[PDB]
DNA sequence: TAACCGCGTTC
DNA sequence: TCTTGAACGCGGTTA
């Protein structure tokens, strides 16, 4: 019935594709040799596939197909279409009566079925499926996806009927119908365009020849084509102290760039002084000359925009958050001028509210920043991404001064708008475009979806490609039960124990200062007898070389034990430290690949016993955690019996809500607790013989990442080799390092999402057991590593796969082998001595792999890809301490390089989005001062100097700060994940600020989720909770009669005329906050390091006073 | 004071 | 509709 709507949509897409140079190309005819080795002979048209979309065509109801958008070698563009029948399978219980089902479904689905056929597939959840047994299914094929749905609609009813007890009519009777044989439907929830891309092995970014036989990969061409790339950014008028609205506000300026060339278009109706050609080259690598069009009115701006789009024919349009600001604004402003943007440039919102087009992919760079840039949310704004990635500080302009600068400073506005463009285009070209289009060559998705989809969904696709190419039947998406019980107690949450985190030592540790070490002798003993096989291991495994080919093996073997000797008899020494960090590379991946860990490889003793019941078993343990009400099962009945009369004028999911609520109070009433958390150590069997398509997929992507990681390591040294005198060489080498580090980091979230996918909702390969084993194993490796560095040094902090430590300046350090050829083989004893212990204790000797598929012969061997990598030595490492006795602070510290630059700053308020600007600016000013001072006491003093400097300001009640600089240093800018309406009954500074932002300015302030709550804490009302004294810092720039009235009720002081900022601030609250930061970063850690409180203006807590005088 | 929540980091 | 995980810090309220 809705077909016509789908047929109509496709049609219009063709007209637009034609309007942008995409004519549907049908290739010539040919009857001869198909083999790809004859590509030049076969007739057709080669092209670089840039984009693909599902569609509906008629013979010349629609028949499903996929449009394929190409850029040919001769500088042209063309479209081509493959047709593929949508299809899903039917499973059966008794595989003897498959034909009865086949006949039944043929007559039942006569309305929608086109064809049908028995097929066989591998099923990894079947007994003796490894010995060669296949799964029989019925392949339902259809003309289009619409009819495939109608089937699922006509089959799901049966599926529910076979799951409900059959209502017999005769009680006394003592054959089975064909409907009762349908077990399930399978591979039914696969996107059609994805289905075609997998089944025909077509990928975006690959070179193909389009022939009558089909598509052929011209693997001779490896380099991408160069599509026309445009990035654009808009500028809007905006109510003072409010947000832009497409209903009233106008576009004033639109900057954009097209393949290196820069353009600006201005609305003279708002921009007064006409703008002319100028140049913004932020850095030499980022050229950007700009020509300007000064259109008269706003519709001439939109018209000039659409006209130019059609001119250059762009296959890629890049923005920064254009999906939810730029595009929807241009759409409404075109609508309010009676302009159909679909009719004009073929863009429209899809079912997610994002703006896509057929001929052109919309590359919202923000999507990449959120997912792949590996940047914190406090840096995912255009300015920070421009600084972190492009490397230049962009032009900034206060949004409240963009509307008036149309009159006042129109030049300053034009530079800021082209600033947004330059940063957007060169961000896309240098970073996004290579990563996205190259990822498209292995992921069966077009660029639009490769950029936006969740990383878990990406892993799914990759895995779907393997499972299909190995004829493995896809498991359906996982579903969680609505309730779940344990020991009679209802479960709230069950999970597993994640990574092992440890804060051990706090305070300052510096290269120029000195530290005490208590060396375990018996650990030096353990290291000296582990010495021989480790040194062979370092060259044989870590460097993959022969012992008898390296020269100075014995030369090193003694120099290390010499220091091991001088450190053995002198097991108590006070020297300088060496600050090092050790990290296992791709830990959870390498833990999975090493152990053949994958969801299907996990079995009970029930099933693998039914196979070859023996190295099928790598018995591995994981730690289960459940959170459950203390109510026993009998208590549950009472609540179930009681809760039956809630409302009158209920779905199961709705009915669960009330059961939970009443169960909290009943559980809290008698056991004096609401949640019980129990650790149940568990065990799982992972068969070493299962089809390893999952774990191999993880290994492919891991190796995919190692290339870029190894290439960054390679170009690091190239910089070291080039003398400081040659700039260009160094500069280019720096440019290479930045490129390769981004590439390896962008692959990281996908590689780790392979371990995350096993817990994702709707996952096809769900295993809590697998995830737990991965996590636990790793905690055991890092704790085993800690136990050793404890014995030979002082480890400072530890997190999952990482260890921060200081080592005696004389512990064995680094050593360079000399190969007989004339090569230098690197050796770092500290890292390599750890690696051995892992290989001797965490190596899979049951790793079986299929050698002979015909005779089903497996060959056990030994696998271990778990390697520590070492970074260092560092000059300083500042770790904080808790305010509570004994407690420490994890996931938070600062490190400094040999040359003093900030190595790593982790976890602190400075990096996070929001938080109090005081602390951020304080933290950004102090950490660099722990590098000052000539001893731990002189160090903590230079810190205290700038500590008192910041303290002075607070006690000075802001007298030293200009009002403008004052608020920009006292404001807290927390964000709201949702709209206000959804935090009902909760209390926070963000909720109050939002609630007060609304009355002060309007309900249209809190309409959208993601509100920036910029607030300041007031003194009045006195002795009232802090969530109630949150003042919007916007009121302090509002009208004086608006200001007063609100500030009076917010303070509950109806007779207050003093509106000056400094009288309202509760400096006491700010002093406490700044006080805790001083305690945690300076004074307390000093006390645990034996220094006296170096900032005596901030006291110690009671317990820590009582412990200096023990 | 311990339990608990939202945000946003570190893995 | 989509949709990687757990561990942790911190200000702040809740029992
Ligand atoms: N975003 C994430 N999602 C899921 N698991 C993650 C994520 N980040 C880290 N992990 C887990 C899996 C990692 O192997 C483990 C150690 O973190 P980390 O060392 O940063 O990554 P890694 O060891 O995979 O990569 P690298 O080679 O860069 O060290 O923590
Ligand atoms: Ca790691």
Residue numbers in the entry: 31 to 90, 112 to 225, 232 to 670, 675 to 710, 726 to 1186
Question: What text comes from the article?
Answer:
The Saccharomyces cerevisiae B-family replicative DNA polymerases, namely Pol ϵ, Pol δ and Pol α, have been estimated to incorporate about 13 000 NTPs during each cell cycle of the yeast genome, and Pol ϵ seems to incorporate the majority of NTPs, roughly four times as many ribonucleotides as Pol δ. Other examples where an amino acid adjacent to the steric gate residue influences ribonucleotide discrimination are found among B-family polymerases. It was first shown in the ϕ29 DNA polymerase that B-family polymerases have a conserved tyrosine (Y645 in Pol ϵ) that functions as a steric gate. Our data show that Pol ϵ discriminates NTPs through the concerted action of a steric gate residue (Y645) and a sensor in the finger domain (N828). A comparison with other B-family DNA polymerases showed that both Y645 and N828 are structurally conserved residues, thus reinforcing their functional importance.
To test the hypothesis that steric hindrance does not allow the finger domain to adopt a completely closed conformation when a ribonucleotide is bound to the active site, we replaced N828 with a valine, which is both less bulky and unable to form a hydrogen bond with the β-phosphate of the incoming nucleotide. Compared to both the wild-type Pol2CORE-dATP and N828VPol2CORE-dATP structures, the presence of a ribonucleotide in the N828VPol2CORE structure did not induce any significant structural changes to the residues surrounding the ribonucleotide. The activity of N828VPol ϵ was comparable to wild-type Pol ϵ and M644GPol ϵ. Biochemical and genetic studies showed that the N828VPol ϵ variant has an increased propensity to incorporate NTPs, suggesting that N828 functions as a sensor for discriminating against ribonucleotides.
